[PDB]
Amino acid sequence: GPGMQDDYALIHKNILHSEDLLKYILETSVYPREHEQLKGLREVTEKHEWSMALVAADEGLFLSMLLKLMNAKRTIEIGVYTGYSLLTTALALPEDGKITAIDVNKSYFEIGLPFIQKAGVEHKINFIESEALPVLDQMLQEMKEEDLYDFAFVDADKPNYANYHERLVKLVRVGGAIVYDNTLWFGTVAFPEYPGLHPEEEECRVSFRNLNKLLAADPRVEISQVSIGAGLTICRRLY
Amino acid sequence: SQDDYALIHKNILHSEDLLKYILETSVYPREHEQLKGLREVTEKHEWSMALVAADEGLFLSMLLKLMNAKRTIEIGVYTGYSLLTTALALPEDGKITAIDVNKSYFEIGLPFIQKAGVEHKINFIESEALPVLDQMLQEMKEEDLYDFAFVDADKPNYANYHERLVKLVRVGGAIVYDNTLWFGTVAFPEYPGLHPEEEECRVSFRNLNKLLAADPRVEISQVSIGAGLTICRRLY
Ligand SMILES: Nc1ncnc2c1ncn2[C@@H]1O[C@H](CSCC[C@H](N)C(=O)O)[C@@H](O)[C@H]1O
Ligand SMILES: Nc1ncnc2c1ncn2[C@@H]1O[C@H](CSCC[C@H](N)C(=O)O)[C@@H](O)[C@H]1O
Numbered sequence: 042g043p044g045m046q047d048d049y050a051l052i053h054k055n056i057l058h059s060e061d062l063l064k065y066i067l068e069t070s071v072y073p074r075e076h077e078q079l080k081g082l083r084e085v086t087e088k089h090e091w092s093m094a095l096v097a098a099d100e101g102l103f104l105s106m107l108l109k110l111m112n113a114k115r116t117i118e119i120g121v122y123t124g125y126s127l128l129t130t131a132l133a134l135p136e137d138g139k140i141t142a143i144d145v146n147k148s149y150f151e152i153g154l155p156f157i158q159k160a161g162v163e164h165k166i167n168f169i170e171s172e173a174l175p176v177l178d179q180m181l182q183e184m185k186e187e188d189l190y191d192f193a194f195v196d197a198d199k200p201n202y203a204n205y206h207e208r209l210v211k212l213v214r215v216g217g218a219i220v221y222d223n224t225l226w227f228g229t230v231a232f233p234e235y236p237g238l239h240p241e242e243e244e245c246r247v248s249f250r251n252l253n254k255l256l257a258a259d260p261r262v263e264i265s266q267v268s269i270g271a272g273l274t275i276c277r278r279l280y
Numbered sequence: 281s282q283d284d285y286a287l288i289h290k291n292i293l294h295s296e297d298l299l300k301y302i303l304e305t306s307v308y309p310r311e312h313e314q315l316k317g318l319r320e321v322t323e324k325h326e327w328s329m330a331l332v333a334a335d336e337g338l339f340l341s342m343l344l345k346l347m348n349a350k351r352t353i354e355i356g357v358y359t360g361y362s363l364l365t366t367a368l369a370l371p372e373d374g375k376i377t378a379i380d381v382n383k384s385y386f387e388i389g390l391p392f393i394q395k396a397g398v399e400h401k402i403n404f405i406e407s408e409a410l411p412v413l414d415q416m417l418q419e420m421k422e423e424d425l426y427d428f429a430f431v432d433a434d435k436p437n438y439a440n441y442h443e444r445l446v447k448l449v450r451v452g453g454a455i456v457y458d459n460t461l462w463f464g465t466v467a468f469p470e471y472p473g474l475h476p477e478e479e480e481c482r483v484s485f486r487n488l489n490k491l492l493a494a495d496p497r498v499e500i501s502q503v504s505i506g507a508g509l510t511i512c513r514r515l516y
């Protein structure tokens with residue numbers, strides 16, 4: 042989508058039955074706890090032409106909760122867009138935390154950069170403007186035990202999730218977390234066939250159905266599929 | 281009894297097919313065998329609704345491992361699915377303080393927990409948790425604080441359990457409250473057609489959700505998994 046919208050047939054990625062329950066969750070437990078600059082970044086992004094790709098706000102507060110409970114301090118993110126999940130991660134890490142951000146389109150990143158600077162956490166971010174898989178392939182060859190990541194957030198092009206997985210279970214430390222966004226894909230994953238989809242909407246649906254089967258059978262990780270936001274899967278490296 | 285209630289089987293996801301997809305694809309292949317046996321015996325029990333969701337169970341296990349929890353406390357054991365999930369996730373030297381008013385529910389799943397080989401990690405306490413939490417407030421040194429707390433007992437007492445647990449859990453420790461979305465009924469000021477006790481839990485959770493969101497002693501994150509849960513993290 043972004044990097045390669047109204048052509049989509051699916052509109053609401055949140056998988057809940059009630060829009061009133063979703064609004065309740067956001068106004069009761071998210072917006073009161075949402076950073077001032079995360080709010081400004083969100084409102085601007087909701088007016089962008091690819092606003093559907095914006096990470097869910099309740100999904101953002103959850104990622105921040107995981108980063109602190111696991112005391113993550115060196116993370117990597119694949120797929121930044123305007124940087125809501127990047128700013129969420131930067132606010133969650135300690136003062137000397139470091140993030141390796143990767144996106145093919147920096148013009149999306151510069152939409153949220155003013156909010157990242159005014160939040161005072163831009164110093165933690167190393168933005169790489171490139172396709173992620175070439176960067177991950179170099180990282181694995183030059184990999185030292187010292188330079189392992191604690192946490193990986195995958196939110197870029199959807200068909201490449203399985204390929205990203207093979208690199209990230211070597212680039213993330215044992216006991217580290219790998220979180221994949223959109224693993225429930227508008228609920229269309231629960232059906233072998235889903236008519237009425239754009240060709241790449243259907244390609245992402247098939248790729249997630251295959252990815253969810255692969256992750257559930259991968260002994261290198263423990264998995265946990267969480268029905269929050271667009272749906273996400275948490276993988277924890279065992280070896 | 282169980283069929284007097286109206287909210288036993290109301291989903292929060294938009295499809296029963298989507299939930300069944302999650303369980304069959306990502307939960308049952310990763311479910312311990314003793315957790316399967318405990319789950320299938322409990323679904324036949326008179327109070328099968330109180331059993332924690334299986335996708336929720338894997339999620340609690342993931343939290344305990346990522347935060348490297350070692351000493352936890354559970355309030356509301358029932359047959360022990362969340363207890364066996366916790367005891368399976370902690371290191372072999374991990375300890376759990378399990379509290380429930382009903383020892384008879386616990387011994388239903390005790391054979392599965394003994395066959396799983398994790399009974400040595402659990403210290404069950406047959407009592408109301410609120411008198412137990414108060415005695416620990418006077419008896420606990422700073423280095424005995426818990427890393428994790430799972431609240432899943434009588435719902436109108438969550439806010440009272442919270443005041444005790446924000447001082448019994450370590451700084452940076454986690455407190456998880458189950459059913460904080462109460463079958464989706466918390467989204468409305470009024471909700472007709474509910475059992476009186478169901479309506480009482482619904483207004484208690486609407487109060488608790490606003491309480492936890494304004495509690496500066498913790499950071500929160502409400503997660504719409506299973507029946508809905510809220511993760512709190514102690515700040516001071
Ligand atoms: N091949 C690729 N490699 C790396 N990033 C890619 C990519 N293809 C697309 N992307 C990027 O992935 C992003 C997906 S939108 C991601 C939203 C963001 N995670 C948030 O929190 O809101 C887009 O910005 C797009 O530029
Ligand atoms: N005041 C109290 N103190 C401690 N436990 C209580 C309590 N009141 C009720 N309970 C117990 O809390 C349990 C709630 S059902 C909890 C289910 C369990 N968490 C699971 O994984 O399935 C019941 O078994 C009930 O006996």
Ligand SMILES: O=Cc1ccc(O)c(O)c1
Nearest residue numbers: 042043093094196223271
């Ligand atoms: O590409 C479309 C898209 C749609 C929703 C998302 O959450 C996302 O990351 C991308």
Ligand SMILES: [Mg+2]
Nearest residue numbers: 094196222223
């Ligand atoms: Mg996404």
Ligand SMILES: [Mg+2]
Nearest residue numbers: 330432458459
């Ligand atoms: Mg429960």
